Amino acid sequence: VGAXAXVXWXWXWXWX
Amino acid sequence: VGAXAXVXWXWXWXWX
Numbered sequence A, B: 001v002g003a004x005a006x007v008x009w010x011w012x013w014x015w016x
């Protein structure tokens, strides 16, 4: 269903 | 900034 695996791109919110 | 790397968890939207 949909496209890819999961929601969004990466892990969490931001960088660090 | 924030926590982690990127936005969300995974790659795209769904599974497949």
Ligand code: NA
Pocket: none
């Ligand atoms: Na395909």
